[PDB]
Design an enzyme around this catalytic site. Structure first.
Site, PDB file in Angstrom:
ATOM      1  N   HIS A   9      -4.068  10.831  -6.558  1.00 13.60           N
ATOM      2  CA  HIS A   9      -3.734   9.479  -7.017  1.00 13.60           C
ATOM      3  C   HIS A   9      -2.950   8.658  -6.009  1.00 13.60           C
ATOM      4  O   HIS A   9      -2.600   7.527  -6.291  1.00 13.60           O
ATOM      5  CB  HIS A   9      -2.949   9.520  -8.327  1.00 13.60           C
ATOM      6  CG  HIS A   9      -3.682  10.292  -9.429  1.00 13.60           C
ATOM      7  ND1 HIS A   9      -3.708  11.618  -9.500  1.00 13.60           N
ATOM      8  CD2 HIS A   9      -4.383   9.803 -10.516  1.00 13.60           C
ATOM      9  CE1 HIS A   9      -4.377  11.932 -10.571  1.00 13.60           C
ATOM     10  NE2 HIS A   9      -4.788  10.848 -11.202  1.00 13.60           N
TER      11      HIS A   9
ATOM     12  N   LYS B 117       5.785  -2.888 -15.032  1.00 12.13           N
ATOM     13  CA  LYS B 117       5.459  -1.999 -13.919  1.00 12.13           C
ATOM     14  C   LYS B 117       6.766  -1.386 -13.386  1.00 12.13           C
ATOM     15  O   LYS B 117       7.862  -1.924 -13.622  1.00 12.13           O
ATOM     16  CB  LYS B 117       4.827  -2.787 -12.764  1.00 12.13           C
ATOM     17  CG  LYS B 117       3.382  -3.207 -13.021  1.00 12.13           C
ATOM     18  CD  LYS B 117       2.410  -2.692 -11.956  1.00 12.13           C
ATOM     19  CE  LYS B 117       0.946  -2.833 -12.371  1.00 12.13           C
ATOM     20  NZ  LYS B 117       0.213  -1.561 -12.321  1.00 12.13           N
ATOM     21  N   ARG B 118       6.575  -0.286 -12.693  1.00 10.56           N
ATOM     22  CA  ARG B 118       7.632   0.493 -12.011  1.00 10.56           C
ATOM     23  C   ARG B 118       8.395  -0.378 -11.007  1.00 10.56           C
ATOM     24  O   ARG B 118       7.833  -0.811 -10.002  1.00 10.56           O
ATOM     25  CB  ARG B 118       6.956   1.530 -11.137  1.00 10.56           C
ATOM     26  CG  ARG B 118       7.350   2.958 -11.424  1.00 10.56           C
ATOM     27  CD  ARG B 118       6.265   3.922 -10.972  1.00 10.56           C
ATOM     28  NE  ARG B 118       5.269   4.163 -12.013  1.00 10.56           N
ATOM     29  CZ  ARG B 118       4.230   4.984 -11.874  1.00 10.56           C
ATOM     30  NH1 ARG B 118       4.025   5.647 -10.729  1.00 10.56           N
ATOM     31  NH2 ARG B 118       3.333   5.214 -12.838  1.00 10.56           N
TER      32      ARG B 118
ATOM     33  N   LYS C 194       6.027  -3.105  -5.803  1.00 13.29           N
ATOM     34  CA  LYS C 194       5.465  -3.619  -7.051  1.00 13.29           C
ATOM     35  C   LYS C 194       5.786  -5.139  -7.179  1.00 13.29           C
ATOM     36  O   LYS C 194       5.422  -5.805  -8.144  1.00 13.29           O
ATOM     37  CB  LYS C 194       6.057  -2.791  -8.198  1.00 13.29           C
ATOM     38  CG  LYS C 194       5.057  -2.036  -9.042  1.00 13.29           C
ATOM     39  CD  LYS C 194       4.676  -0.613  -8.685  1.00 13.29           C
ATOM     40  CE  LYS C 194       3.221  -0.794  -8.899  1.00 13.29           C
ATOM     41  NZ  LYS C 194       2.445   0.417  -8.826  1.00 13.29           N
TER      42      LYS C 194
ATOM     43  N   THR D  27      -3.588   1.240 -14.652  1.00 14.37           N
ATOM     44  CA  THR D  27      -4.088   1.322 -16.008  1.00 14.37           C
ATOM     45  C   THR D  27      -3.444   0.240 -16.863  1.00 14.37           C
ATOM     46  O   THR D  27      -4.163  -0.274 -17.685  1.00 14.37           O
ATOM     47  CB  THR D  27      -3.808   2.806 -16.385  1.00 14.37           C
ATOM     48  OG1 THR D  27      -5.000   3.458 -15.932  1.00 14.37           O
ATOM     49  CG2 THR D  27      -3.496   3.138 -17.819  1.00 14.37           C
TER      50      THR D  27
ATOM     51  N   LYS E 177      -5.479  -2.443 -19.792  1.00  9.39           N
ATOM     52  CA  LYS E 177      -5.054  -2.595 -21.193  1.00  9.39           C
ATOM     53  C   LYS E 177      -4.931  -4.053 -21.588  1.00  9.39           C
ATOM     54  O   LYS E 177      -5.211  -4.458 -22.722  1.00  9.39           O
ATOM     55  CB  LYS E 177      -3.656  -1.988 -21.548  1.00  9.39           C
ATOM     56  CG  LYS E 177      -3.524  -0.510 -21.568  1.00  9.39           C
ATOM     57  CD  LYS E 177      -2.106  -0.044 -21.512  1.00  9.39           C
ATOM     58  CE  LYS E 177      -2.195   1.187 -20.605  1.00  9.39           C
ATOM     59  NZ  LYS E 177      -0.834   1.678 -20.443  1.00  9.39           N
TER      60      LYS E 177
HETATM   61  C1  LIG Z   1      -0.247   1.950 -19.233  1.00  4.98           C
HETATM   62  C2  LIG Z   1       1.168   2.387 -19.088  1.00  4.98           C
HETATM   63  C3  LIG Z   1       1.693   2.725 -17.853  1.00  4.98           C
HETATM   64  C4  LIG Z   1       0.943   2.515 -16.600  1.00  4.98           C
HETATM   65  O1  LIG Z   1       1.541   1.532 -15.650  1.00  4.98           O
HETATM   66  P1  LIG Z   1       0.609   0.967 -14.434  1.00  4.98           P
HETATM   67  O2  LIG Z   1      -0.486   1.956 -14.180  1.00  4.98           O
HETATM   68  O3  LIG Z   1       0.107  -0.387 -14.809  1.00  4.98           O
HETATM   69  O4  LIG Z   1       1.345   0.695 -13.003  1.00  4.98           O
HETATM   70  P2  LIG Z   1       2.781   1.399 -12.674  1.00  4.98           P
HETATM   71  O5  LIG Z   1       3.763   0.761 -13.589  1.00  4.98           O
HETATM   72  O6  LIG Z   1       2.976   1.000 -11.248  1.00  4.98           O
HETATM   73  O7  LIG Z   1       2.625   2.872 -12.830  1.00  4.98           O
HETATM   74  C5  LIG Z   1       3.003   3.131 -17.748  1.00  4.98           C
HETATM   75  N1  LIG Z   1       3.778   3.163 -18.854  1.00  4.98           N
HETATM   76  C6  LIG Z   1       3.254   2.788 -20.094  1.00  4.98           C
HETATM   77  C7  LIG Z   1       4.158   2.748 -21.336  1.00  4.98           C
HETATM   78  C8  LIG Z   1       1.956   2.408 -20.196  1.00  4.98           C
HETATM   79  O8  LIG Z   1       1.412   2.116 -21.440  1.00  4.98           O
END
Ligand SMILES: *Cc1c(COP(=O)(O)OP(=O)(O)O)cnc(C)c1O
Ligand SMILES: O=c1[nH]cnc2c1ncn2[C@@H]1O[C@H](COP(=O)(O)O)[C@@H](O)[C@H]1O
Lengths: 823, 69
Positions: A363, A554-555, A560, A662, A666
């Site tokens: 990943h 996002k993180r 980001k 992901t 959504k």
């Molecule tokens: C879908 C999801 C996620 C996933 O976050 P992302 O893949 O959009 O990007 P990062 O934030 O960079 O990992 C994380 N946490 C929850 C609650 C969630 O539904």
């Protein structure tokens, strides 16, 4: 004996029976009555009243896979991001109606009850959520699939915002237990650490090993109305407890008190560098798991079907192992060890089985993230698997000598051992060498693994490299979080979409129908209204439910680029103050993420993000035209709440940085338009929806490399753009920080002098995009129809497709949306 | 320098007022690597593995430091 049977145990959608089992569990399982039952107490009786229907088809599903004996595939991952199971188990089991009516009669509110449930702290991010959508899809398309991984007592942290600075509290979610898991103390397995390799006669004998017992818990995962329920088996650590007098290590010294706690917090804590506890946790899960796997292989009617050794010859026809990322990698040196030392196969037969058994999902994009362990750590704790891994390496480097003879520099580039100061073993190269299919996670991401990062492996075995683009599941991420959109999509095209999502394309015929357009905008207005309410009721703010709902969840990393977005919010600010009376599309900008304790920029960022908002949302001229909210302790239950509400999806990572994304998918599914660079998951969703229907913007990946080529000199931008030059001076002088001016000093310098991700480059065009955004907004009918084209094109992003492709293309088994007879 | 006199010392380079300027405008390393040929040359010796023949890639984080931060 034959009369001990599942048969007469359930008259399901019946309100009078669900009331009965409710009252059985409150009393007999909880040993509580209404005079002393709490909402947790009633939450648990309901949990269990629904669970009985679950385990009944767990039953039936799992009896059926034993009779039928299918390829059953083990999804190994060290983080399973589950979040709340009740509504998801009811909707999937079709019990939601009779339970709500039932609890309504019992005079309990089910929604008050559903919010007692703790968010299953097994996971942290993407890697983990991905494991939970994939397990849902694998049930629905009735695969014999197992999810394996550790049980973390303490989740990871539960964040709190005290004074605009982040605080990590701990998630002791297992505190009043977990009604959905069954402990199996019966199947507790040993796992050995350290030791010594006694090369004796017909082999090697790993002796003098410390033991840690892995005791397993089972959790059921239900399909979409198909009555297959699959298993999620999570391992917990338990030290042997002779530590008192028995062993004669002790009596004299119990300082091996330490053994028992260094064992115990293998299972305790999620992570969160080269720390022996990560390596003991990863090997912990692999070892336990594969003994279950070979236990089930020789048991699963194959103890009868031996023909030779109970042969491992047919092991790849009955087992598929998925190494999700490099955390499971000792699955390849451990399955050899068992096969070669414990059974007795020789190395070339045993290797045959491993490579045909093992497959690996990557990943990461940046070579700087791939996982790598010192050989002095592996010699100390896994001295036997260091052996196997060197022989694996030797023989792989003779394969490469076969193929590009004369080469010196590939031997050394491709090798499992890595030289320098601190000789390392490269875990990503282990995986490729002992797996039969390596895959990425979005088209571009799998191509740049083939083209730059693993290319000398892509040349030796180009066959290996696949791609399987991620997915989101339509049950939890459309049906469950958004009933209102679910429903109106169903009037028009029917229910099959929920278990067949590409047929959301049918929607594209209703683009101009005003009944759909209206209804489609009504549900968002619903969703926004309710989210606006939650933003007062649990947390507080005065949202304007009519505003453009701009969310970035996002993180909190530099890459980001929430900071980007902050430059833009401060921009909007400054305009509403400069030109008090120009009509501006009111927005409510919502940002959310967990910092990552120890990462000081991210802690400085959430601080910015709160105080921008302390300023603007209190300042009288901006009124209700702008507000900035930080969404505290973002987790799955909040995602299913704010993703339904959102009008604008803030997907801005510097391009070339994401591997996929992901939350992206959504958001599309719930009619939220995407502003975003041409990166990661954004690319194929642009490709589905059509670029006319996407807000793409900023420097494409080509342009990144160009800017690096000549050198990104951020000052030039500062000095062309007068808004940018101004918001920097506002941060710096203390406009946002009047009791400690100097606070955002290290954010201002970073940006100004050493932005590794170029915020300033994409600033100008970002806000030009943003203006497009607000315009279209100020034009309902055309806003609300872009949405329709987006939603209608969501098909490629249901995880049912990602697994269907994994199924056919790597594991070798057929999908089937067939309803097992059951209950 | 002052007690020996400048003439008796080999002083050089960017004086402070200059480093403060090159920061005020932003030090773009690349430019110097693209005027100066012998510089180009040594950078390209470092990355090719001239000094490092068994792990050529070895001084890559030195080379990137120099190049980009
Ligand atoms: C879908 C999801 C996620 C996933 O976050 P992302 O893949 O959009 O990007 P990062 O934030 O960079 O990992 C994380 N946490 C929850 C609650 C969630 O539904
Ligand atoms: O030989 C069998 N025949 C029928 N069902 C079985 C058999 N072995 C296991 N099961 C079912 O499989 C479930 C899981 O067992 P495990 O997979 O061996 O851990 C049990 O709860 C039974 O429903």
């Amino acid at each position: 004996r034959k009369q001990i049977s599942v048969r007469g145990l359930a008259g399901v959608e019946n309100v009078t029976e669900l009331k009965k089992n409710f009252n059985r569990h409150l009393h007999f399982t909880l040993v509580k009555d209404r005079n002393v039952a709490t909402p947790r107490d009633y939450y648990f009786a309901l949990a269990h009243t629904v669970r009985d229907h679950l385990v009944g088809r767990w039953i039936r599903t799992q009896q059926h896979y034993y009779e039928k004996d299918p390829k059953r595939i083990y999804y190994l991952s060290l983080e399973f991001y589950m979040g709340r199971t009740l509504q998801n188990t009811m909707v999937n089991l079709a019990l939601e109606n009779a339970c709500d009516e039932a609890t309504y009669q019992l005079g309990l509110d089910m929604e008050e009850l559903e919010e007692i449930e703790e968010d299953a702290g097994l996971g942290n991010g993407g890697l983990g959520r991905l494991a939970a959508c994939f397990l849902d899809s694998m049930a629905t398309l009735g695969l014999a699939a197992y999810g394996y991984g550790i049980r973390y007592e303490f989740g990871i942290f539960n964040q709190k915002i005290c004074g605009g600075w982040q605080m990590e509290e701990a998630d002791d979610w297992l505190r009043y237990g977990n009604p959905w898991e069954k402990a199996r103390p019966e199947f507790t397995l040993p796992v050995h650490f350290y030791g010594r390799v006694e090369h004796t006669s017909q082999g090697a004998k790993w002796v003098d090993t410390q033991v840690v017992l892995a005791m397993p818990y089972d959790t059921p995962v239900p399909g979409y109305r198909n009555n297959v329920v699959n298993t999620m088996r999570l391992w917990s650590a338990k030290a042997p407890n002779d530590f008192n007098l028995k062993d004669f290590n002790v009596g004299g010294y119990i300082q091996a008190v330490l053994d028992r706690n260094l064992a115990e917090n293998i299972s305790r804590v999620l992570y969160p560098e080269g720390k022996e506890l990560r390596l003991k946790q990863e090997y912990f899960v692999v070892a336990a798991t594969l003994q279950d796997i070979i236990r089930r292989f020789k048991s699963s009617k194959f103890g009868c079907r031996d023909p030779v050794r109970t042969n491992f010859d047919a092991f790849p026809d009955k087992v598929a192992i998925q190494l999700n990322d490099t955390h499971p990698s000792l699955a390849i040196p451990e399955l050899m060890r068992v096969l070669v030392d414990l059974e007795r196969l020789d190395w070339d037969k045993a290797w045959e089985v491993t490579v045909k058994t093992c497959a690996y999902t990557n990943h990461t994009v940046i070579p700087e993230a791939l996982e790598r362990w010192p050989v002095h750590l592996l010699e100390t704790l896994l001295p036997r698997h260091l052996q196997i891994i060197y022989e694996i390496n030797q023989r792989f480097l003779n394969r490469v000598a076969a193929a590009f003879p004369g080469d010196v520099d590939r031997l050394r580039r491709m090798s499992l051992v890595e030289e320098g100061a601190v000789k390392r073993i490269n875990m990503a190269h282990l995986c490729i060498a002992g797996s039969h299919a390596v895959n990425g996670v979005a088209r571009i991401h799998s191509e740049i693994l083939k083209k730059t990062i693993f290319k000398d492996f892509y040349e030796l075995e180009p066959h290996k490299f696949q791609n399987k683009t991620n997915g989101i599941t339509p049950r939890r991420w459309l049906v469950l979080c958004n009933p209102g959109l679910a429903e109106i999509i169903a009037e028009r095209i029917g229910e099959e979409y929920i278990s067949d999502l590409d047929q959301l394309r049918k929607l594209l015929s209703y683009v101009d129908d005003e009944a759909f357009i209206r209804d489609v905008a009504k549900v968002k207005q619903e969703n926004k209204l309710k989210f606006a309410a939650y933003l007062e009721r649990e947390y507080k703010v005065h949202i304007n439910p009519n505003s453009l709902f701009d969310v970035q969840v996002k993180r909190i990393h530099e890459y980001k680029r929430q900071l980007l977005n902050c430059l833009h919010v401060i921009t909007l600010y400054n305009r509403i103050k400069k030109e008090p009376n120009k009509f501006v599309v009111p927005r409510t900008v919502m940002i959310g993420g967990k910092a990552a304790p120890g990462y000081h920029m991210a802690k400085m960022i959430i601080k910015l993000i709160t105080a921008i908002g302390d300023v603007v949302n209190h300042d009288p001229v901006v009124g209700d035209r702008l507000r900035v909210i930080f969404l505290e302790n973002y987790r799955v239950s909040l995602a299913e709440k704010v993703i339904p509400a959102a009008d604008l999806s803030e997907q801005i990572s510097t391009a070339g940085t994401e591997a996929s994304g992901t939350g992206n998918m959504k958001f599309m599914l719930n009619g939220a338009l995407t502003i975003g660079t041409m990166d990661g998951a954004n690319v194929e969703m642009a490709e589905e929806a059509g670029e006319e229907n996407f807000f793409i913007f900023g420097m494409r990946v080509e342009d990144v490399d160009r800017l690096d080529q000549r050198g990104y000199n951020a000052q030039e931008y500062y000095d062309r753009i007068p808004e940018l030059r101004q918001i920097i001076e506002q941060l710096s002088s203390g406009f946002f920080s009047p009791k400690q001016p100097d606070l955002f000093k290290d954010i201002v310098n970073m940006l100004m002098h050493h932005d590794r991700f170029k915020v300033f480059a994409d600033y100008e065009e970002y806000v030009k995009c943003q203006e497009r955004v607000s315009a279209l907004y100020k034009n309902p009918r055309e806003w609300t129809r872009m949405v329709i084209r987006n939603i209608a094109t969501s098909g490629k992003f249901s995880s049912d497709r990602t697994i269907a492709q994994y199924a056919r293309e790597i594991w070798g088994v057929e999908p089937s949306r067939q309803r097992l007879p059951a209950p």
